[PDB]
Design a protein around this nucleic acid. Sequence first.
RNA 1: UCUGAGAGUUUGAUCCUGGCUCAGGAUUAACGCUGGCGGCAUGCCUAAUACAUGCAAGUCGAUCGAAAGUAGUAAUACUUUAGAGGCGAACGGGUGAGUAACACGUAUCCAAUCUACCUUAUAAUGGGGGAUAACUAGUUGAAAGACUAGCUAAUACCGCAUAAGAACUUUGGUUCGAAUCAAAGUUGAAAGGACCUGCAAGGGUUCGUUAUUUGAUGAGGGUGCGCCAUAUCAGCUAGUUGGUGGGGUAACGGCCUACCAAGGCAAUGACGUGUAGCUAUGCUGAGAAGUAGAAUAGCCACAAUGGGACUGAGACACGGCCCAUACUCCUACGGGAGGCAGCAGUAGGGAAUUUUUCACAAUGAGCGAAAGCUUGAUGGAGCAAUGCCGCGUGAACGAUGAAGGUCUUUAAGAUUGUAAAGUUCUUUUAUUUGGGAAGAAUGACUUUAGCAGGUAAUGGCUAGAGUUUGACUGUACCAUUUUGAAUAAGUGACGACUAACUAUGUGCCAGCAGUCGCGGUAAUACAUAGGUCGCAAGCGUUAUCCGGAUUUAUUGGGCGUAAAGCAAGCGCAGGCGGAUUGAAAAGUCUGGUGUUAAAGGCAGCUGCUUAACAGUUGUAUGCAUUGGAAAC
Lengths: 80, 77, 67, 203, 276
Amino acid sequence: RMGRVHYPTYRIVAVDSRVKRDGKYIALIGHLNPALKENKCKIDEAVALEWLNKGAKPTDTVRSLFSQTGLWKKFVESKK
Amino acid sequence: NIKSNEKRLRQNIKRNLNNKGQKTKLKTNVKNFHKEINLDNLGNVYSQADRLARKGIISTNRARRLKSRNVAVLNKT
Amino acid sequence: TNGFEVLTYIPGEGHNLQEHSVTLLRGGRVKDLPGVRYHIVRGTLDTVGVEKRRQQRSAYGAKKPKA
Amino acid sequence: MKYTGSIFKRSRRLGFSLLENNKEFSKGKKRKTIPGQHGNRFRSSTMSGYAQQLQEKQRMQYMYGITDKQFRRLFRLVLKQRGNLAVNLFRVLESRLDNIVYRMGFAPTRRSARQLVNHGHVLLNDRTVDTPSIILNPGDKVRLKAKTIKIPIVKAASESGVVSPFVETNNKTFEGTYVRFPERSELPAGINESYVVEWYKRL
Amino acid sequence: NKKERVSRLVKMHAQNRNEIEEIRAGDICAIIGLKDTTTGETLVDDKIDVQLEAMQFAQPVISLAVEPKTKADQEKMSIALSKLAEEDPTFKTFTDPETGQTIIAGMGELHLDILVDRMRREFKVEVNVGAPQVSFRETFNKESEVEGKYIKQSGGRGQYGHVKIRFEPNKDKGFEFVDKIVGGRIPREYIKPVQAGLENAMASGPLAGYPMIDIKATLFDGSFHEVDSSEMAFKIAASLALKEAGKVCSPVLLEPIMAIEVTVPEQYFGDTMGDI
RNA sequence: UCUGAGAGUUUGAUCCUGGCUCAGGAUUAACGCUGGCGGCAUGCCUAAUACAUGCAAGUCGAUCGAAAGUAGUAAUACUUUAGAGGCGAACGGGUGAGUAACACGUAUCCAAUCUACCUUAUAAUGGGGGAUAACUAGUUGAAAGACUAGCUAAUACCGCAUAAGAACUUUGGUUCGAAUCAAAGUUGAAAGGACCUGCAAGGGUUCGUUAUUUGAUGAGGGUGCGCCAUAUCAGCUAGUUGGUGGGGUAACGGCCUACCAAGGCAAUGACGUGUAGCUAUGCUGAGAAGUAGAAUAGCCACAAUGGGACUGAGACACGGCCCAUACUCCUACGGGAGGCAGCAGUAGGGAAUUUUUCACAAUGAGCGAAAGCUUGAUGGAGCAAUGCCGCGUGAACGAUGAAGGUCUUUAAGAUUGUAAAGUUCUUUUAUUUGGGAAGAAUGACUUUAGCAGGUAAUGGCUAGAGUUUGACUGUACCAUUUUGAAUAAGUGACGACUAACUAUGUGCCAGCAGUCGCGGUAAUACAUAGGUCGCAAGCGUUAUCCGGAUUUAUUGGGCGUAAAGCAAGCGCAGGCGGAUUGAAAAGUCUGGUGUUAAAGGCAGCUGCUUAACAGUUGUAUGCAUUGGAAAC
């Protein structure tokens, strides 16, 4: 969490396996206000497809908001 | 102090003993190659280099380079 | 703490200087003498500061009068 | 200060009332004199326009009741927006919470308005407030937080309150709305714009 | 009135630390943490009654004085004596204007030897061994009329002063003054400065640096300039006159003799005789 | 939309140039004066000085032995890991000393690169062998432990066989010192879990095994460019310069070696000295620009000091090793142990910086199928006004100015002052009571439907349900919640610059002083008290930077006498330079393209009562490159 103290914030950051937080990133997915949980956030909807194209499995915790988005519905064709 | 480090410290020591044993085995094989040149010993040393580049003991690029030099110098015939 | 030694005017009435009492020198300006370029500070040292000053209250040992 | 502890010394030094007579009430032979003891056949030796700068800045400083750090901060806030910034400066100063609620007829004076706001006697559109900093915009409805409607002092003050044409007020339900921005001639313009912009020597 | 933070419990021994998480009631232990501590404190966390158990606390008897050898050393003795006073409530240390040095107190010599060992090994003090010194009063014989005298040119017009006054010492009444000028030979504004030239010397001595007390006077004669004037000249001349008066008439000190109520069960009273 | 304020000072008076000082902010600022609180951020710039304890890294029992233990007659259900082996421990932290450069930043070629775990997809998982940790016995010992022998397990390791594809080689087709294509000489890989199904023998689910290609990620090299000062640092350097041979190397290269050859750089400032982590950026200014390199971020580099090495993709490694140096500690005097520029913390220095604190709640990283575990990463609270910011010290009426104090030097008065008193209101803060947050439903787990290679089940993918994660918090916040104005403001100045004058003492003294400089008988300049003013829980105030200081001048200066034209000349390099018309487009302008991270400011907005703050869209040149332009 960053930003104003006592006010959590969590940008959806990019990391393959070994990029520590608050540093270099390949692409910014968007933002998130983790105070009122409704998945209200702007995303490219193609940058996640960018990860899905060449691996670098996404972080396991931001998975729920993408389930609300539904990335499997456009990801199931990864192995067909 | 630290405990797994000591386990790791003694873990690779035996590994290193075995690996240097096979490395000097390759060394004496390529020394026999140096003494006089034949097809059979060159094939044997290539077969050994295949295993050694196969493992992490020897870099694949170094093995490829050395085998290229050896075939280059034997093709003088 | 360095080897160089500087001269300094003594503001305030009387003096709490007692033949090698610790002092704390501070940037100052006195045009009456070539060699004085600093001042002693009153209010925090072995010198507890002095009264009879309330128009000026900070650059001295002057408390607020007890009243 | 928020409560300077003495207002007539300062006013008799300057000479500005609230509307026409509030700093004087025939209290001790109502007169136009300084509170000092240098006589009153003369005022001072040095004369400068910066003295008028100080007089106007104190008059605007205290007749709406702000501090000085907030003062420069809000000049910056208005500096954000372009145009004739002086009139915007004054209209934003008028837009302050205590200023508006006073202009609502809801407060005997700005000090009283800040006091009633401080102890939680105001509430608008589910927005409580304890800081006199609300900027009033068209579309704001202001309520009294009628839990404390038992107070007879507020209703007595609103009996003879001053009405403003650019807003709307109600005399009995303690409610109002901010219809429009403040106007130049409708308000005391003793503060001269050129002098105010003259004082701005920060940058 | 402080909520203290407790780090851990432990058992001290000369070898090393020995810590145990809990201890039952009625036992003894040591606590690391508890940012400030002194003897006989009561600590409450179970929200129970606080309590005190102290029926004796020794007071010091001996007073010794030690001079410093370095200014930072002096500050370090002050700090170290404060620390030892906090460590054990048995003795008090003073740096008073009566002596202007370190006034220590304790029981015996070997306790002081241990203290100097501590402040040498840890506190870096190089304490010396000396003898105590106490303040004394200082009176003086009944001298005759004295005169204050001064010419010095001081930045422009010369500064002049002549005074002729008498000091009659007596412990019945203090500083007096009688207007004994009938013609008006002296201005009234000169009445005060000469008196001032006395006050600066009412609490110090020129021979031993100890207060000269019971100083009476009366302005009897004097001399200034016609076309020139001076005000503090009177005070400076009076100070010089005080020095001159002290020079001539053999002042004598006055020492505080103490009452001692010595006790013994009539066994070591031989010490009492052979010493007293 | 952007675009610059003066004042004072040499003189009998009066002008040029010119310095100095103030009016403006800003700080990782002490310390006075102190002081109520809410958030808001920060808190060794100083000895890269040495340091106790807890924390700073573990994890796999669904890979195994092996002993041990709770319940078990027994078989063992289960426990748990000292141990082997598996992964990781190099990532994460802080420091900035040495480094003056390919360190950094930018554009780059890597026809010289490599990258385990992911990525699409491919090839297979046959067996064989024997040690050994642990355990046991002993010597040596409190321990340390070493040396023998016996006992084994495993995805540990070593052959055999087998190769899709790979390397290696030869022929045949390709590009603006190389690459692809068919054929073949040589050669090599391994393993078992867990479950289902099947009497079985097999088969399937899934981890992993061994191989391959797309990628990306990561690291490294060269290149052009820009990126301190110094002439009281004039010549400097010899694996140095060049190639060959050979070697080493993820990899190109005197990277290294042998053979010889003889340079290489330089006045366009090399070499050497002081000094510096760099950059983005912070501050200031109207800008050009100047100062600094705080927090925060990226790159590099270090790790008590100097070297040398192994490990694995990956290190020459804060807490992996060896040696030496230096220091500390223990000891049985036999011998060893140790590395806070990890967190706190200590000791010293230092004017100047905190907790010998808590939860892993969320998220990050490592392990694991999962129960989850580890985490001073992370987030909290503690201290500090250190800075920006809000907020208490009350509010309406109430007087010919209550007491006092001061002057009126003569005696209404004037003054602090409607502030006092008094009427009454109210609780920001302080008090009673109750309710009570969110952040935390993320997360796996426990149950269904469809989906699909595979039907025989077991597996997963989502739509739905339930299980919980809280140090925070007793918080935020709310409530016809109760006594109660009750719980309180300092602060420098008052001659002029800049604003507000009287009096006591004062007598070139005490003194005061940003500048002008005042003070010896009437001080508005000193102390004193009243009053007056300016800021404000801060005000004093020097170290600190720019602006004014156009006070080293592209913007934006001068040299006749105020400072300066050399004593003059022959002039190399260099700068500038007649007209005409031609190519071309180097400078230059201009239109697209890649890039110029995050963050800051600017504009628009969202959230907290309100800004400070955070988040969000654009916002920042410039470098390379495609196309026009030919005026100079």
